[PDB]
């Protein structure tokens, strides 16, 4: 007759992180379920990160585009850090078009009927001329863990 854990309170103290609460537990099961669920949550959870980028006038990722003060490699890192939710698909292709002096934020992506950006203030790059525009296609898919480029165009 062990007491069973039931979720009691989900304190969404900020937009990113929360504090779920399990109660009651017999003595010993606290550290067991704690370490176990910590190791499962860090190990393998379904995320929604990005895989392929195709900037329009760019051949290889080591080039430079006329009119943007970051390299194409830095644009790839800033798109690698993109926090995006998908709802009813395996993979999805997002489209970006932006023209004019100033930043290209993450809210300038033409959103589909199910893709949802969760942090729209995310900077990608900075356009820096009156007629100098980027126009890219982004490929965002589901997955699990860390799948680098060397294993898998």
């Amino acid at each position: 007759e062990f007491l069973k854990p039931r979720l009691v309170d989900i304190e969404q103290v900020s937009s990113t992180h929360a504090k779920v609460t399990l109660e009651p537990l017999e003595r010993g099961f606290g550290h067991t379920l704690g370490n176990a669920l910590r190791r499962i949550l860090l190990s393998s959870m379904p995320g929604c990160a990005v895989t392929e980028v195709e900037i329009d006038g760019v051949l290889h990722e080591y080039s430079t585009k006329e009119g943007v003060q970051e390299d194409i490699l830095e644009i790839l890192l800033n798109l690698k850090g993109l926090a995006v939710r998908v709802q009813g698909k395996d993979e999805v292709i997002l489209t970006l078009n932006k023209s004019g002096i100033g930043p290209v934020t993450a809210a300038d992506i033409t959103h589909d009927g199910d893709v949802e950006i969760v942090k729209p203030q995310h900077v990608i790059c900075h356009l820096t001329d009156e007629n100098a525009s980027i126009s890219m296609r982004i490929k965002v898919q589901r997955g699990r863990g860390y799948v680098p480029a060397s294993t898998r165009e």
Binding site: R39, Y62, P148
Partner: protein, 50 residues
């Protein structure tokens, strides 16, 4: 006696792996020996892994 010279620049991107040499700024050398997962790292009572 040469007609034309073609030079091609490959651009490899070498990441890190067990066997590279890292070192601080005091003489503490070392071959990195195992690239652990995130979970196995000793963490503290805040949550952050070392």
């Amino acid at each position: 006696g040469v007609l034309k010279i073609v030079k091609v620049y490959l651009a490899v991107k070498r990441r890190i792996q067990p066997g590279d040499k890292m070192a601080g700024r005091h003489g503490n050398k070392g071959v990195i020996s195992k690239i652990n997962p995130i979970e196995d790292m000793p963490y503290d009572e805040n949550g952050t892994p070392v």
